[PDB]
Structure formats: C-alpha cells, structure tokens
C-alpha cells in the first residue's frame, strides 16, 4: 500500500475508529487513527485557512487551522519524517463525503520546500502557489472525483450542477513534480503548506473532511476509502 | 516538429548556417538561426552565469551572460510569446558537442514564473532552484547523454571517466512539472531563468554550446540535432 | 530640490500644465509633466491594482494599472535610472487633493529590489509586503496628512470621521529603510512595486491622484505641492 | 537597559560566568548566561554557516551552526517571545574580542519575518539578503568598531591593516528598518536568520564570539561589553 503522512481537517466524529467526539484537526502518520488531535470549531459555509509546517531541526509537524476573527485550532506532533516517508514524494490535497456530505472546495494552495546541503551549504528549493485553478491545470494530477475550473476553484469532491455536494465521493489533487522531502546529507530542511477552503453542508452534520498529505510518488486513491477514510487509507487500522 | 524558444550560448561559429564569425549569445525563435545575437567573449574553464528574463508588459526577451570581473554580454529581442508558444510548456537546458567538443557542466539552475489573473488580480507562481544535482534527481527529465550527480553537477553532454568531454554528444534536462507560461486572462505575467555553467575545452577549440529553452511539454531531442543544432532543432532552417 | 521618479495615477486633467484631457497614468522623471502617459478608465469606488517594473538590462520603466474584469492601462518609458537617481533612495506612495477631492486609500503595498554583483555574481535583495497597516506602523515614515490603522489601511490624504475625503490635503508614506536602487558594479538589477488602491469620489468629480515614487532618502513633501503637484514637486516645470 | 534575545557563537569558555568548558552555541534570553547551550566544534580559519528559526506555533527558538563536511551543532529553547521582546525591534549581528582575539568576519546575512493577521489571514513580510557589504551600506547601522567594505565583507571587530585582529574590540551591525516581530492579533508568525562567518585567530585560543540578536529599536553597545559580554549585555547577570 501507499505510505501516507497527512494533516486532516476531520468534520465527522467516527468514534468507533478512534476520532474524538467533535470535529477536529489531526496528524496522521501511516494511519487514519491520528497520533494527535485538537478540537476544531468548524464553521459551516465560511472560508477558512490551514497552515502546515515542519523542519528537520525540531522534527515537529505542526498545523494551525482558523477562520478570520475566530480563535485558531493548533496541533503538533514530534515525528522524524526521515524514518517514515521515502526521500522523494508527491504532495497533495484529498477529501471525501460518505453517508453525510459537504463541499470540499479549495480556493488557494501553496507549498514551499527547502534542502540545504551538508557539503556545500547551498540550498535546493521548490515553491508553488495556486490562487486560481483553471479548467485544464496541467501541473496537477486529479484523482477520483476532483475537478478544477469551476469558479476558478478546485473541487475535491463531487458537486452537482445545482451547487449541492454529493455523498460517497472521494477526490484528490497532487502537484505534478516529485518533491525531495528529506535527504541524509542535508544539514537543514523544511517545508510549509497553506490552503484556503470552503466546506458547506446542507445536512444535519457535515462529513467527512479535507486533508493535506505527503505520499509515495505513484500514490492513488485506495479501494474503499470514501467517507471516514478521507481518500487516504485502505482501512481504519 | 517541436515548438522551441531558446537562448543559446554558442561557442562555435557555423557561418554556413548564419552564425556570426565569433562565439556569441543569441535568441532563437523556432529556428537555430537566431533572430538577434551578441558577441560573447567566452572564457574557457571559467564558471559563468546566464540570466534570462521576459514579461508580458514589455514582451521583450533578454539575456545577460558573463563571468565574474568581466564585461557582460547582453542580447534582447521583442517577441510576443503568446503568439509563439503553447500556453503550457516545459523548460530545460540543452547542450551538444559534434566534431569538436567541450564540457557542458551546469552548476546551478533556477526559474520563476508568475501569472496574475485579470479577474481576481491574484497570482499563480512556480519557483525552483537547483544548486546541487543528485544521482537520482527525480524532478528532472534527463534526455540523451545528460547525467546528474558527478560532483553534484548536471553534465549535459558525455564526459569520460578521465574527465575528457566527448564529441557527437547531445543531452538535455527538463523540469518535471509543466509550466503555464502565458494566459489570455492574465493581466501581467513574467518569467526569469538563471544558471551557472562551466564549459572546459581541454584542446582549446570548443563546440557546440548550451541553451536554455522553452518547448512543448512532450518535446524530445530531435533526430539529427547533435553538434551545431544544439539538441534543439532537426535542421538549420 | 528633491530628485523624483514616479508613476502617477492622475485622476484630474490639468490641461494648463500639460495633462491630457482625461484621467491617465504617467511616468514622471524629475517633472510633473509626464514623459509618457496612457489613458486610464478609472472606476470610482472600485478597488484597483498597480504594477510597476524596471530592470537594468532593458532600462525601461513600465506600469500597468487596472481593476478586476476590466481592460488594463499600460505606460512605458525608456530611461536609464543610473543617470537620474542617486544610488541610494527611499521608495514611497504619495497622494493629494486640492479644490476637488477623493479618498486615496492604500490596501496593500509590496516592493522588491535586487542587485547582482559583477565581481561575485551573488545578489543583494530587499523585499517588503504590507497587506495591513497598523496604527503604529514603525517601518513607515508618514508625511503630511497620511495616517495608518483605520480599517487596517493607509489613508494617504485626510478623511473625516464621517468618511468624507477632504480637499487641500497631501500625504506620503515612505519605507523606513534606504534602498540601493542602482550600482555601477552590479551586472544585473531590477525592482518591482505593487499596490492596491481605493479612490472614492462621493461627488463624482475626483482629484488629484496617487503616485508611487522613488526619491532622495531625505525627501520631504515640497512646499506648494498639494493638488495637481501630487505631493511630489514644488512647481509644474 | 536594552532588552536582548540572542543566539551566541561563543568561542571562549568563561566558566566563571556559567559558560560550559568548551566553545559552544547558546540561546540568550535577557542574560549572557545562556538558557541553553550545545557544544560547538569551532574550526579556526574556516567559513561556517548559522541558521536561526522561530515560529509562534511552536514558540521554540532554534539554531544550527555548521561547517561544510562537518557535523552540525544545534540548540533549541522553548520561549514565548511575546513575553520577552517589545512588539517592534531591530535585528542585528554583534561580536567582541578581549584579552584574546579573532576576526569576526561576516560574508553574508539574510533575514525573513512574517506576520499573518487573525482578522484577514493576509500577511505582512520583510526580507533582506546581504551577499556583499559595500563601503557605504546605508541600510545598516554600524556601531562600535564595525566596518563594511573590506573585501566586500562586514568586519564586526577591529582588524589592523596587516590583516590581524585586535583585542578589546566590540562592533555591531543592525538592519535599518524596525521589524514587527510579534503581534497579539497575528494568527501565525515566524522569522529566520542565516549568516556565514569566518573566525580566524592567531592566539593560543580565540575569543570572544559572534551573536545574532534582536533588541529594542534604539539598542546601543552597553558600557563595558567587550570580551565575554559580546557587545550585548552591560554585565554578566
Ligand atoms: Ca472522521
Ligand atoms: Ca554554432
Ligand atoms: Ca492632474
Ligand atoms: Ca564566553
Ligand atoms: Mg482563489
Ligand atoms: Mg552547485
Ligand atoms: Mg489590506
Ligand atoms: Mg559575501
Ligand atoms: Mn479523525
Ligand atoms: Mn548561433
Ligand atoms: Mn498628469
Ligand atoms: Mn556562552
């Protein structure tokens, strides 16, 4: 199977697989059962922001999710990614709906990664910034139900013509270039990701969530990953 | 055939196909017969720098090539790239040898492209910086004889174990992600490229040169392009 | 007197001093009588964007001014700034009202300047980005009637408590650090400025305009510069 | 007195004021007696690199100091700078010699700071990069014995004409613009600083060290701060 590291914005409490009893943000290391979570005051219909950071000095993956004028939610987990991910990866966004649903709309996404050489002390860097997504956005690999171009946005899951979100939908978008996320010979390394999102649901409760993720380069949506598995994992182990 | 825009650092004067009678830099628009050239006082065995810029306001492609403590060479050409290239391209470096030869070693390569939306005034941007090239550089597509990793450099053309450049060699490196180089609905767009290079000629008579180029995404080295055609064109038309 | 290079967004045609008979954008080199203008279809009460660029390879100062979903206005002028400005300058925004008036509200301002050494080929760079202006914005020198903090914006000219712009007002904001704008030993240099602005004219007859300018470091608002002189020049010569 | 936060590269063990018995890097919070140190394998005559980072999510100030091809030294300390520094500061480099001496040469210095608003989720940012220092570097405030321009470098302490370093010398360089280092209303904030240095000593042991520091805007070299106080503190409390 794929190797996954993710920061989840989980809108539905699946307490039977270890979720806390409230919408929450979490850090997922090779399992949908987050290693760490924080309660998230999710706001139906409002545009929010996610900020994710990691560096090789502290080796602490942290995320902050917030809405303008509200208090933020933050989660952190100590993890040495050199022991978890392959050296080269792809980065992406993933989202799902199940019995319950919501729009999983992405309005912007940026990423920056840097590796400073132990031998020369010079750096390699990659940076991308999407503020609009065209109908043919060739530097993204769309998987599942993901589409781009509608109102200039990236819709991770299925939305009908009438603007309503559909259930049992899974969609992901990965940046086309492989990313060198760690290197033994790098003296310092870091990455950061930011995205803005709009989750609206007409249901009695939204589901299932959005995640920023890092995976093997040939990662694909696992079988049976709609709903609570967020398009990320083949099971709930 | 491919669609090619390039800046050439031409170390060998092929006067039968329109080169001036001295080493020169040139702007090539869909032909190896440059639309504009400038004399280039090349310094064999010395590390040089090339800087290439263009923006959609001036629609002028300009390049500056030089070595530390020497006078620079500059060439410029007015051209509306929206009428020349496809909207989506790849960018790369190419070089060749022929009857005569030289090392075509790249020590660093950076690129930044940005497109600002007419409807939102927000920007999409891509940036990469290589200061070292590893043996498995997954974000580069190597073509022909190009290799990475020897001393952390990109060797565009074949170099023997003893360090001696070989003749009849052609090689290119392209960035893995497609690049959105122009857009009708972009109110302002720009790109910039920089690279550092070391052309060594152990017999003091080098050929054929290095180029930065922009092509259709699926471009391959054309048949018949070693030597004076720089790995870019199938003929001298 | 000061040494001023500016891009003006001139909302009021002063034909007795050489303005064209319509709102326009212009390039001003040591005189309020622009060296080049372009017609500007200004949209009162709408948020606009201005983009200014220059580099030492082309030696062309260009500006683009526009509003979302409208056609842009562009103006360009060839000028070697090494022969015009001092090596070290400050950069700023200026605006004025006179007999007639308008809000001259700035919502964002960014600038980037870079100088690449001829001897080392390494670069010095400065970058700042303001997306919000606080009540005590210590990295700005406010001159005249300019204030910061109301709604997080920079109000270059006087606005009353009821929100109504006042006449005979002049104000400027300059970045605190001096900027090295050109250097003889720099092989390549460039700058770029961007700002977003909101000019509201409650009586539909606005004056006088906003400018981005580059001046000697110790520049103050000239005596007699309210109104058509834009806070930049002591007279119309 | 001034308020100081610093990362020290301490080349001389003053065990009588709490230094460990070896050259070391440390984090100094309002006292020369570091809150945390790490042993530093300082290399006489070799060019090294320092990297300093902090963000408001983790609130952990960390530093990595290293030489090419050697193992790095790293030090980290949990500290909420909102409770230590004023909101607006200046940033700088400082160095000293005493009975024993060394060159305290700076070859490059860069800094980046960012503040994202809780109300709009937009960012303010400052970035500067010095790769050469001219004889008249107007965006630096030089204090004490600091000079710029010699071989394009910043010499923090006195160096004689013959290339030899002098004793009892103190010198600092601060960036001219005030920096907004924290803000209550910022949802996320971060800063990073990098510099390259050359410390050479002809003595039986080098002294006293180099520091990156953050202080009140009007900070000046304290009385009696040569030698072990690093030009930072008025005493050893
Ligand atoms: Ca869940
Ligand atoms: Ca040729
Ligand atoms: Ca006017
Ligand atoms: Ca000491
Ligand atoms: Mg958007
Ligand atoms: Mg290199
Ligand atoms: Mg703003
Ligand atoms: Mg230097
Ligand atoms: Mn969960
Ligand atoms: Mn040629
Ligand atoms: Mn005018
Ligand atoms: Mn110490």
Tab-separated table of N, CA, C and O in Angstrom, chain B residues 25-64:
chain	number	residue	atom	x	y	z
B	25	UNK	N	26.053	34.955	-28.088
B	25	UNK	CA	24.809	34.555	-27.463
B	25	UNK	C	23.686	34.946	-28.401
B	25	UNK	O	23.790	35.933	-29.151
B	26	UNK	N	22.603	34.183	-28.386
B	26	UNK	CA	21.553	34.527	-29.321
B	26	UNK	C	20.161	34.190	-28.834
B	26	UNK	O	19.989	33.382	-27.934
B	27	UNK	N	19.164	34.836	-29.439
B	27	UNK	CA	17.768	34.488	-29.159
B	27	UNK	C	17.217	33.735	-30.345
B	27	UNK	O	17.239	34.240	-31.483
B	28	UNK	N	16.729	32.510	-30.083
B	28	UNK	CA	16.235	31.610	-31.127
B	28	UNK	C	14.746	31.408	-30.966
B	28	UNK	O	14.267	30.911	-29.921
B	29	UNK	N	14.015	31.813	-32.000
B	29	UNK	CA	12.573	31.696	-32.032
B	29	UNK	C	12.212	30.750	-33.172
B	29	UNK	O	12.154	31.151	-34.334
B	30	UNK	N	11.978	29.490	-32.831
B	30	UNK	CA	11.552	28.479	-33.814
B	30	UNK	C	12.569	28.202	-34.916
B	30	UNK	O	12.250	27.585	-35.930
B	31	UNK	N	13.796	28.596	-34.692
B	31	UNK	CA	14.883	28.339	-35.663
B	31	UNK	C	16.210	28.480	-34.984
B	31	UNK	O	16.338	29.312	-34.088
B	32	UNK	N	17.205	27.698	-35.409
B	32	UNK	CA	18.558	27.813	-34.847
B	32	UNK	C	19.272	29.082	-35.355
B	32	UNK	O	20.295	29.513	-34.801
B	33	UNK	N	18.690	29.680	-36.407
B	33	UNK	CA	19.217	30.922	-36.966
B	33	UNK	C	18.661	32.066	-36.114
B	33	UNK	O	17.553	32.543	-36.325
B	34	UNK	N	19.458	32.481	-35.149
B	34	UNK	CA	18.990	33.422	-34.126
B	34	UNK	C	18.429	34.684	-34.739
B	34	UNK	O	18.974	35.203	-35.730
B	35	UNK	N	17.363	35.175	-34.135
B	35	UNK	CA	16.747	36.452	-34.508
B	35	UNK	C	17.614	37.650	-34.079
B	35	UNK	O	17.495	38.732	-34.669
B	36	UNK	N	18.440	37.473	-33.062
B	36	UNK	CA	19.344	38.506	-32.590
B	36	UNK	C	20.535	37.835	-31.943
B	36	UNK	O	20.357	36.840	-31.275
B	37	UNK	N	21.746	38.349	-32.154
B	37	UNK	CA	22.919	37.809	-31.472
B	37	UNK	C	23.685	38.949	-30.826
B	37	UNK	O	23.450	40.131	-31.154
B	38	UNK	N	24.597	38.561	-29.949
B	38	UNK	CA	25.611	39.475	-29.408
B	38	UNK	C	26.943	38.745	-29.276
B	38	UNK	O	27.007	37.572	-28.970
B	39	UNK	N	28.046	39.442	-29.529
B	39	UNK	CA	29.336	38.824	-29.324
B	39	UNK	C	29.539	38.413	-27.874
B	39	UNK	O	29.161	39.124	-26.949
B	40	UNK	N	30.156	37.252	-27.702
B	40	UNK	CA	30.381	36.673	-26.390
B	40	UNK	C	31.829	36.309	-26.227
B	40	UNK	O	32.366	35.528	-26.973
B	41	UNK	N	32.512	37.020	-25.342
B	41	UNK	CA	33.925	36.771	-25.080
B	41	UNK	C	34.012	35.627	-24.088
B	41	UNK	O	34.160	35.845	-22.870
B	42	UNK	N	33.875	34.395	-24.572
B	42	UNK	CA	33.850	33.239	-23.695
B	42	UNK	C	35.218	32.988	-23.106
B	42	UNK	O	36.256	33.227	-23.758
B	43	UNK	N	35.176	32.509	-21.854
B	43	UNK	CA	36.346	32.225	-21.063
B	43	UNK	C	36.344	30.745	-20.732
B	43	UNK	O	35.689	30.280	-19.790
B	44	UNK	N	37.073	30.004	-21.528
B	44	UNK	CA	37.123	28.590	-21.326
B	44	UNK	C	37.638	28.206	-19.937
B	44	UNK	O	38.644	28.768	-19.462
B	45	UNK	N	36.981	27.230	-19.306
B	45	UNK	CA	37.367	26.785	-17.976
B	45	UNK	C	36.994	27.677	-16.817
B	45	UNK	O	37.347	27.368	-15.674
B	46	UNK	N	36.266	28.750	-17.073
B	46	UNK	CA	35.840	29.644	-16.012
B	46	UNK	C	34.339	29.499	-15.792
B	46	UNK	O	33.570	29.381	-16.757
B	47	UNK	N	33.907	29.607	-14.556
B	47	UNK	CA	32.497	29.492	-14.268
B	47	UNK	C	31.774	30.775	-14.626
B	47	UNK	O	32.202	31.885	-14.258
B	48	UNK	N	30.767	30.642	-15.496
B	48	UNK	CA	29.942	31.756	-15.885
B	48	UNK	C	28.507	31.666	-15.416
B	48	UNK	O	28.046	30.648	-14.936
B	49	UNK	N	27.811	32.776	-15.591
B	49	UNK	CA	26.426	32.967	-15.228
B	49	UNK	C	25.552	33.491	-16.409
B	49	UNK	O	25.972	34.373	-17.168
B	50	UNK	N	24.345	32.936	-16.557
B	50	UNK	CA	23.409	33.408	-17.552
B	50	UNK	C	22.111	33.788	-16.880
B	50	UNK	O	21.650	33.063	-15.969
B	51	UNK	N	21.515	34.915	-17.300
B	51	UNK	CA	20.300	35.448	-16.705
B	51	UNK	C	19.329	35.778	-17.854
B	51	UNK	O	19.665	36.562	-18.763
B	52	UNK	N	18.138	35.183	-17.811
B	52	UNK	CA	17.152	35.333	-18.887
B	52	UNK	C	15.835	35.874	-18.340
B	52	UNK	O	15.310	35.325	-17.343
B	53	UNK	N	15.256	36.914	-18.974
B	53	UNK	CA	14.041	37.491	-18.435
B	53	UNK	C	13.079	37.844	-19.534
B	53	UNK	O	13.476	38.140	-20.662
B	54	UNK	N	11.811	37.829	-19.163
B	54	UNK	CA	10.741	38.228	-20.069
B	54	UNK	C	9.523	38.590	-19.274
B	54	UNK	O	9.288	38.017	-18.215
B	55	UNK	N	8.771	39.588	-19.734
B	55	UNK	CA	7.487	39.855	-19.101
B	55	UNK	C	6.462	40.295	-20.157
B	55	UNK	O	6.860	40.710	-21.270
B	56	UNK	N	5.189	40.120	-19.841
B	56	UNK	CA	4.107	40.334	-20.794
B	56	UNK	C	3.764	41.818	-20.979
B	56	UNK	O	2.930	42.140	-21.842
B	57	UNK	N	4.384	42.693	-20.181
B	57	UNK	CA	4.157	44.119	-20.333
B	57	UNK	C	5.031	44.654	-21.449
B	57	UNK	O	4.508	45.296	-22.366
B	58	UNK	N	6.304	44.295	-21.432
B	58	UNK	CA	7.253	44.771	-22.460
B	58	UNK	C	7.354	43.819	-23.642
B	58	UNK	O	7.749	44.221	-24.727
B	59	UNK	N	7.084	42.526	-23.388
B	59	UNK	CA	7.194	41.483	-24.419
B	59	UNK	C	8.554	41.504	-25.084
B	59	UNK	O	8.659	41.480	-26.316
B	60	UNK	N	9.590	41.589	-24.255
B	60	UNK	CA	10.958	41.623	-24.692
B	60	UNK	C	11.727	40.498	-23.993
B	60	UNK	O	11.802	40.470	-22.788
B	61	UNK	N	12.307	39.583	-24.760
B	61	UNK	CA	13.106	38.510	-24.171
B	61	UNK	C	14.535	38.961	-24.176
B	61	UNK	O	15.102	39.305	-25.253
B	62	UNK	N	15.148	38.991	-22.981
B	62	UNK	CA	16.509	39.489	-22.827
B	62	UNK	C	17.356	38.501	-22.058
B	62	UNK	O	16.867	37.774	-21.200
B	63	UNK	N	18.639	38.502	-22.378
B	63	UNK	CA	19.561	37.613	-21.698
B	63	UNK	C	20.877	38.337	-21.438
B	63	UNK	O	21.328	39.142	-22.270
B	64	UNK	N	21.508	38.007	-20.323
B	64	UNK	CA	22.810	38.545	-19.997
B	64	UNK	C	23.671	37.345	-19.612
B	64	UNK	O	23.277	36.496	-18.775
